[PDB]
Ligand binder design. Structure first.
Ligand SMILES: OC[C@H]1O[C@H](O[C@H]2[C@H](O)[C@@H](O)[C@H](OCCCCCCC3CCCCC3)O[C@@H]2CO)[C@H](O)[C@@H](O)[C@@H]1O
Ligand SMILES: *C(=O)C1=CNC(C(=O)O)=CS[C@H]1c1cc2n(n1)CSC2
Length: 265
């Protein structure tokens, strides 16, 4: 397998699209590998981790409770939304909504949560407050996935997303319990978690949130490490590629393989 940077370059050339990547030490924040780390990519569903960071902050401040039941209507369902659709009659707790948003990529759940944090503008304000002056959410579901070429709306950079995730998980911005909850939601991802585990060698920790969008947009924000420990934050985004979903997944996996085989740094 090529060196990580060489594999990232190869992936970009094969996808005929832009790849953005950062590998960051979780404990120290040190950048280990970076490719287009300051370039903008659509967040897609990956924004939902930051969203639930804002939710947990409100819980910590006493302005929210994970137990609080939110009741909604059929008109609030924006697409598929399998969990939200199932609990239409009885509602869902704020905690449940975050679980659905993060572990099952439920889009209606994300909108309901956005309505508790002051919408996209409220979430962007939260980001500015924690020192992220780059990441921005502008739209609700489902429009935030549009991924128009050169459109800055609903984008982050690999560097900013990695830094923000580290802040939310480790910095004491959130309480101990809230930090633990956000991590557990990522550990519990049902969309990609199990699949990734099925192809990871024994001993490799994974927690993640993935995203998909228009024009080949694809993304993953993850914690990864040997000896069953979350050693590193890895963020990979793809954009403006005509490639199949299958190849896009294969290329991201290929970058992961390169990281595993060249782990010591
Ligand atoms: O010497 C290291 C390892 O080399 C191989 O492991 C392979 C594995 O068989 C393959 O399935 C995977 O594909 C990579 C799949 C990664 C899954 C996605 C990872 C995500 C996580 C972080 C964000 C982006 C990538 O590569 C590794 C390394 O070559 C051997 O199979 C294994 O016995 C050995 O311990
Ligand atoms: C997040 O990246 C996404 C959320 N979930 C789903 C789904 O529940 O069907 C599919 S992948 C992706 C996404 C892309 C688009 N939407 N959701 C709604 S419109 C385009």
């Amino acid at each position: 397998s090529p060196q990580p940077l060489e594999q990232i370059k190869l992936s970009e050339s094969q996808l005929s699209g832009r790849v953005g990547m950062i590998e960051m030490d979780l404990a120290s924040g040190r950048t280990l590998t970076a490719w287009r780390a300051d370039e903008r990519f659509p967040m897609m569903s990956t924004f939902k981790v930051v969203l639930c960071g804002a939710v947990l902050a409100r819980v910590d401040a006493g302005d929210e409770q994970l137990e609080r039941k939110i009741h909604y209507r059929q008109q609030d369902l924006v697409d598929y939304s399998p969990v939200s659709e199932k609990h239409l009659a009885d509602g869902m707790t704020v905690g449940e909504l975050c679980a659905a948003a993060i572990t099952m990529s439920d889009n209606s759940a994300a909108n309901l949560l956005l309505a508790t944090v002051g919408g996209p503008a409220g979430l962007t304000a939260f980001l500015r407050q924690i020192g992220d002056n780059v990441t921005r959410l502008d739209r609700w579901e489902t429009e935030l996935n549009e991924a128009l070429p050169g459109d800055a709306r609903d984008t982050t950079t690999p560097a900013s997303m990695a830094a923000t995730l580290r802040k939310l998980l480790t910095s004491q911005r959130l309480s101990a319990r809230s930090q633990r909850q956000l991590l557990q939601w990522m550990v519990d991802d049902r969309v990609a978690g199990p699949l990734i585990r099925s192809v990871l060698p024994a001993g490799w920790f994974i927690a993640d949130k993935t995203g998909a969008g228009e024009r080949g947009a694809r993304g993953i924000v993850a914690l990864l490490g040997p000896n069953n420990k979350a050693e590193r934050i890895v963020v990979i985004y793809l954009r403006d590629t005509p490639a199949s979903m299958a190849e896009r997944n294969q290329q991201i996996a290929g970058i992961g393989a390169a990281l595993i085989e060249h782990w010591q740094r």
